[PDB]
Amino acid sequence: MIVFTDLDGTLLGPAREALERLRALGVPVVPVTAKTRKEVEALGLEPPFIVENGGGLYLPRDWPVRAGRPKGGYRVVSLAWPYRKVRARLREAEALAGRPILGYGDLTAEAVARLTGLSREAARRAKAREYDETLVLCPEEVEAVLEALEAVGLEWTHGGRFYHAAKGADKGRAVARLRALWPDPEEARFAVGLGDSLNDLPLFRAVDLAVYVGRGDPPEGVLATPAPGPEGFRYAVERYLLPRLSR
Amino acid sequence: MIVFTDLDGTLLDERGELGPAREALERLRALGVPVVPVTAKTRKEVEALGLEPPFIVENGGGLYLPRDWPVRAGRPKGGYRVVSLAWPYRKVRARLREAEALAGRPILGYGDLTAEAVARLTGLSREAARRAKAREYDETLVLCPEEVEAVLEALEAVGLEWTHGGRFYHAAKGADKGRAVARLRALWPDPEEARFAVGLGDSLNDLPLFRAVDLAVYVGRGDPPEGVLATPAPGPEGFRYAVERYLLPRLS
Numbered sequence: 001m002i003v004f005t006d007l008d009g010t011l012l013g014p015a016r017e018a019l020e021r022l023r024a025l026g027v028p029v030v031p032v033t034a035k036t037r038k039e040v041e042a043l044g045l046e047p048p049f050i051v052e053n054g055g056g057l058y059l060p061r062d063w064p065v066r067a068g069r070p071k072g073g074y075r076v077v078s079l080a081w082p083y084r085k086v087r088a089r090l091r092e093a094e095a096l097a098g099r100p101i102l103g104y105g106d107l108t109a110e111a112v113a114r115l116t117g118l119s120r121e122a123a124r125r126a127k128a129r130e131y132d133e134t135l136v137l138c139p140e141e142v143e144a145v146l147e148a149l150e151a152v153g154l155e156w157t158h159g160g161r162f163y164h165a166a167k168g169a170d171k172g173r174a175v176a177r178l179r180a181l182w183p184d185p186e187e188a189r190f191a192v193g194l195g196d197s198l199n200d201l202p203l204f205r206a207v208d209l210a211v212y213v214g215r216g217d218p219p220e221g222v223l224a225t226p227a228p229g230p231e232g233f234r235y236a237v238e239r240y241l242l243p244r245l246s247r
Numbered sequence: 248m249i250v251f252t253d254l255d256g257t258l259l260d261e262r263g264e265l266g267p268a269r270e271a272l273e274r275l276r277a278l279g280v281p282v283v284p285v286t287a288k289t290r291k292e293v294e295a296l297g298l299e300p301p302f303i304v305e306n307g308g309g310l311y312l313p314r315d316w317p318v319r320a321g322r323p324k325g326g327y328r329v330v331s332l333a334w335p336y337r338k339v340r341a342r343l344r345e346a347e348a349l350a351g352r353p354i355l356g357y358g359d360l361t362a363e364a365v366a367r368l369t370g371l372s373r374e375a376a377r378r379a380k381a382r383e384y385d386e387t388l389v390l391c392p393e394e395v396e397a398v399l400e401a402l403e404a405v406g407l408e409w410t411h412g413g414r415f416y417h418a419a420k421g422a423d424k425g426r427a428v429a430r431l432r433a434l435w436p437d438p439e440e441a442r443f444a445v446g447l448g449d450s451l452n453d454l455p456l457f458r459a460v461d462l463a464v465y466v467g468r469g470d471p472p473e474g475v476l477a478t479p480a481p482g483p484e485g486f487r488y489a490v491e492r493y494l495l496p497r498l499s
Contacts, residue, residue, distance in 0.1 A: 091367065100389055102355065107365035114344065115353055136353060140389030 015230035054174035055131025172202035308384025308422035310334035425459035449486035
C-alpha cells in the first residue's frame, strides 16, 4: 500500500498523529503538492515527493530504481517543461494578448509576501519555481489571457487564488510514474489518494482508493469523510487504511 | 531668461537623444541662457543622459541643485543638494499598501517588479529599467484597465495623487512640475535672470509646467493648450524653431 497525500490545504495534530501512525507501521506516504521543492524542504518532508502539481518527482539520491538525474541530494524526474521555458512562452503570450501578463517570476519576494500573506522567507521559497508559474491576472483579462496561453502551447490550472501556467505538469501522471519507479511492486499495487480539492481529480483518477477530505462537495465516485480537514484525514487513516494492516 | 524644458518628445528625439536639439541648446549656452530639464524621469535616468544640475525629476517631486549652488537650500547628497517637494517613495509605497487593502485587490507598481519585468513591460534594457526603478518620489503603477477607477478612488482615499503618463498611471503626493519650477525660480541666484521664464513641452502632461512660466511653447504632435504657442514641427525640430523665433528676439 502507498498513500499519496495532496493535502496542502489540510496538513497545515491528531492529523500528525495519524501520519506518524502510518510511518511507524512501514506504510509509504508520498506528498503530492503545488508547492516548490524549497517549500517542501522547509516543511521537513523527505523524498520521494511530487512538487509543483506533478511537474517534478523527487527521489532519494539512493533510490533503488534508477531514474531522472541528480540535482542537489536528490534524483529528479522532470515531467513538465522547466520554469525558464514556461517563462519564455509567457512572454510570447503577453505579446499576443497585447497586455501585461505578470507572474511570480516578475515580482519581488516582498511583493509575493504582501499578496499571499507569507513571510518574506516563505515568499522566496514560493518564488523558487522549477516548472509551474503562478500568475497574477486581472479578473477581466482572464478570458483573453487563457486563450493566449493555449495559443502558445501552455496549459493552465486554477489553484484557489491564482491561475497557474505550465506544460506537462499533471498529478496523475506523476503518481503513475512514481508507482512505476517503486522498488516493491507488490507494495505499490494498491494506491490511495487523499485530496481536498476538485483540482485533485487527476490524483484521484490515478489511485485505487480515492478519498476527498476537502470542504467542497466530493467528486462523484470519490469516497468522502464526515468532516473535512485534519479530522477528515485522521478519520480516513483510522477507518480505511490502518485496518488493512490486520490483513 | 531661464528655459525650462520637458525631456522625452521635447528636448529628446524619437530615440531619446539630440537632433537639431544640439544646435539649439548650444546657441542658448553661448547666449548665457540657462536650460533646466524638467522631466518625469528619475535622477539616475537623468544622470545616464549626462545632464548636469539644476534639473527637476519625477514630475516635480524633486529639485536637484549643484552642491555649490549660491542659494543654500535642500539637503546634501554627494555632488548635489536636493530639494524634496513630494512625499518620499517609501511613504508613497506605504500608502499604496493601504489603498490595496481598501480596493480589495492587488495594486502593483515598479517597486513590486524586477528590473527584468520592468524592462520587458517598457521595452527598455535591463540597465535602463534599473535606473527607472530608482524612484525617490513617484511610483509607476501597472493597473488592470477595468480596475483603474476603483484603484484611483482608493489612492485618493489614502491621500495620494495620481497622473497618467502615456502608458502607465502614476502615484505621488506633491509632485508638480509647476510648483518645482516656481521653487527653483525662487532659489535662482540672480532674480533678474529668473524674472522671465520659458517652458517648452510636448504633452498635456506639461500643463503644470506651462502655467508656471511666462512664455509657454508646445512642440508636441497635437493641438496646443489654450494660451500656449505652437510650432510648425514637433520635437527637436520645434525646439529649434522656438529658440530661433520666440527666444532670440528677447535676447538681441
